[PDB]
Amino acid sequence: ARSERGTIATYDGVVLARSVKEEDGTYEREYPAGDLASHVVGYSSPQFGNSGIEKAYNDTLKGTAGNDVTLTLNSKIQQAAQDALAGRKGACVVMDPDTGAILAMASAPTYNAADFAAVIEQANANPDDSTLVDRAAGSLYAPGSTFKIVTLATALEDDVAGEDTVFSSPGTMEIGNATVSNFNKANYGSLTLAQATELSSNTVFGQLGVEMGADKLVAGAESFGFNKEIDFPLYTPESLMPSAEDLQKSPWELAWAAAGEPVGDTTRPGRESPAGPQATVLEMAMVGTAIANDGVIMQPYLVDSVNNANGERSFSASPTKLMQAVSKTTAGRVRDVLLGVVQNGTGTAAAIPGIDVAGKTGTAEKENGNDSWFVGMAPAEDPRVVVAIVIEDGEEGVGTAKAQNVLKTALEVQGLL
Numbered sequence: 001a002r003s004e005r006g007t008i009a010t011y012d013g014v015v016l017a018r019s020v021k022e023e024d025g026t027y028e029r030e031y032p033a034g035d036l037a038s039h040v041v042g043y044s045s046p047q048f049g050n051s052g053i054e055k056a057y058n059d060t061l062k063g064t065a066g067n068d069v070t071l072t073l074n075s076k077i078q079q080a081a082q083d084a085l086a087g088r089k090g091a092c093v094v095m096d097p098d099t100g101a102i103l104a105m106a107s108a109p110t111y112n113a114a115d116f117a118a119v120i121e122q123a124n125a126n127p128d129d130s131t132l133v134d135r136a137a138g139s140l141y142a143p144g145s146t147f148k149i150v151t152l153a154t155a156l157e158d159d160v161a162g163e164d165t166v167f168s169s170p171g172t173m174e175i176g177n178a179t180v181s182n183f184n185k186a187n188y189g190s191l192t193l194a195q196a197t198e199l200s201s202n203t204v205f206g207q208l209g210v211e212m213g214a215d216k217l218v219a220g221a222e223s224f225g226f227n228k229e230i231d232f233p234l235y236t237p238e239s240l241m242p243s244a245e246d247l248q249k250s251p252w253e254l255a256w257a258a259a260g261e262p263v264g265d266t267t268r269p270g271r272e273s274p275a276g277p278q279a280t281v282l283e284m285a286m287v288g289t290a291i292a293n294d295g296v297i298m299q300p301y302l303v304d305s306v307n308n309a310n311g312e313r314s315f316s317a318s319p320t321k322l323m324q325a326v327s328k329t330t331a332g333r334v335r336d337v338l339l340g341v342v343q344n345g346t347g348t349a350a351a352i353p354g355i356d357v358a359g360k361t362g363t364a365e366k367e368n369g370n371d372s373w374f375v376g377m378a379p380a381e382d383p384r385v386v387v388a389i390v391i392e393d394g395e396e397g398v399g400t401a402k403a404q405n406v407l408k409t410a411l412e413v414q415g416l417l
């Protein structure tokens with residue numbers, strides 16, 4: 001109450017939170033950037049406590065004045081991510097695949113950071129109001145066909161199949177005594193594995209899952225970070241995969257997991273492992289960074305530096321490897337297939353004039369619609385940016401269309417456009 005709490009600002013210097021000395025010599029917290037990165041910045045209140053960065057870095061911010069925290073976020077990329085989600089429910093994460101730095105992290109619906117108290121009040125009055133939910137880091141989603149990046153990468157790494165391997169792609173087929181179906185039950189005839197990735201065929205990926213088997217599929221997902229607790233300053237639930245033991249018992253569950261749908265029956269007493277895959281948007285961005293960065297996932301980070309009131313520097317982020325998902329050769333082969341998705345497949349809306357874009361579209365099944373996903377990277381040959389976006393209950397392909405705008409803004413900011 002008595003001393004100046006430190007500021008929180010973006011990497012390009014937009015102040016998200018600061019303390020100003022009042023009339024009576026007291027200090028009050030100000031949030032002068034409207035709804036820019038609201039969920040990330042969080043709030044600090046003697047009534048409501050803390051959340052976001054205000055919570056995670058409370059000790060350094062509190063402090064003699066407290067220390068100033070500089071985030072990795074770029075305000076223009078952050079705004080583009082928020083604009084992509086405007087009027088929708090969902091989330092968007094933009095990362096630098098070479099460092100793990102988070103350039104944008106947005107959730108929708110959102111709110112003005114300054115108005116956190118009123119928003120908390122509304123949440124209490126209406127348990128259905130989900131504005132305060134951190135969807136980018138804090139929520140698990142079914143990734144749907146975006147997860148095929150993991151299945152494909154695993155199949156190539158383990159030599160289960162190659163890009164040229166041919167699979168039947170019927171509209172529906174029985175696997176493990178129930179049905180796996182292509183989107184809209186489309187019959188594509190025989191497809192190479194590359195073509196099946198371009199068209200996003202569930203029946204091909206289901207068969208590929210059964211062929212590789214539960215042990216390999218689960219190990220492959222774990223190589224990309226599933227079932228690992230990943231350290232992060234904001235609450236991030238562990239992304240989940242079933243045990244190999246559970247998937248072994250149901251070829252149908254295995255086939256759907258390979259296609260990104262978590263169909264494991266968790267209503268069944270006695271089930272030992274979770275349904276999966278279930279992932280955060282951050283995790284799906286990390287999957288993208290593995291493909292972009294020669295197979296290596298860098299540790300995601302949000303704080304670039306901390307500086308004292310003196311101006312001196314007490315913390316500087318050091319980009320660091322988290323895990324090697326696949327080999328450099330495998331990553332490159334997958335990246336080439338994902339370029340095909342955008343050039344010739346379901347991802348054409350992600351194309352950007354003058355820069356090659358590679359990525360994977362996703363549809364995740366819901367009762368009366370779908371969640372719409374895109375994970376992609378640009379420039380395709382040596383990416384400088386990765387974007388993951390989910391639009392809940394979205395029109396077909398909307399995730400890809402919105403990702404285009406976010407990627408374009410990132411490339412403009414970086415000078416490539």
Ligand SMILES: [Mg+2]
Pocket residue numbers: 160161165
């Ligand atoms: Mg074969």
